[PDB]
Homo-oligomer: A and B are copies of this chain.
């Protein structure tokens, strides 16, 4: 079995198409995600007679060991894909339709800045292998490419699934090495994050802030320090869901700002008690009345500035 011979130096055109079936196991630390999907290759197959007799108009069924099947290699994968060939339907003429389910572990970078409200773009790269016949070119068949409407990823919604031609631009560049890029755009569902992570932190912070309406030093110390312990425990709780991230993040900036605010509150309580002991109650009362307005307003301004700095 060999590919079709040359006809008139016309470049051989291959119309590929990837039809998604399943997408699962989106691992962040490994920066991978498994896929389970179909694949279609429709290559013009003249000069290989397929019984074009008008009495043989039946669509012929062929096994993999019947003709030359173009072998496409994925660039960013862990191992070679498993070729679970599904069905090949070939007309009495040189027209080819073919479907095959594969499973692979794909490598694709993920950007986790602006983490709870982020979007991603997964990539799949395809190259074609050399052959002794004329040069093989890559083209996209827009009818074949799609998704199964039943692909479910835990916590995301799928926007689009398109394809485009991009030159490989590899340093080897033994030939042109035409390459295909498949882009899967996904968006994270963020609503549950508000009640799960955001509101409890604000409740704890306000419980801490109730110490500006009091004057008992022991009660203030207990309030602020126990609230700090609760904040650390809640950070431990929320650290499990988040992925390990060796760079700065919006949530991390918020956590750091909360730590800073706790430190400043402790300083304010200490100053108030020291003045009250040294008998300057007017100054102590003025400072403790100023704090009640100062803290929430500065917190709001810092949040606005951080939001602008991280979301354009």
Contact = CB atoms under 8 A, between A and B. Distances in A.
A250 interface: no
Contact of A19 (B58, B173, B226): B173
A237 B237 contact: no
Q: How many copies does the complex hold?
A: 5
A199 B259 contact: yes
A146 B244 CA distance: 27
A13 interface: no
A309 interface: no
A261 B294 CA distance: 26
Contacts of A127: 86
B222 A218 contact: yes
Contacts of A34: 78
A55 interface: no
Interface of A is mostly: mixed
A9 interface: no
Interface band, chain A: 35 or more
Interface in A64-113: 73, 75-76, 78-80, 82, 84, 86-87, 89, 97, 99, 101, 103, 107, 109
Interface in A190-235: 191-193, 195-196, 199-200, 203-204, 206-207, 210, 213-219, 221-223, 225-230, 232-235
The 10 closest A-B pairs by CB, nearest first: A155-B246, A61-B132, A203-B263, A225-B226, A195-B256, A189-B246, A232-B233, A210-B270, A200-B259, A207-B266
Given A58-B133, A97-B174, 11 more contacts: A30-B154, A36-B78, A58-B132, A73-B84, A79-B103, A155-B244, A199-B259, A214-B274, A218-B219, A219-B221, A222-B225
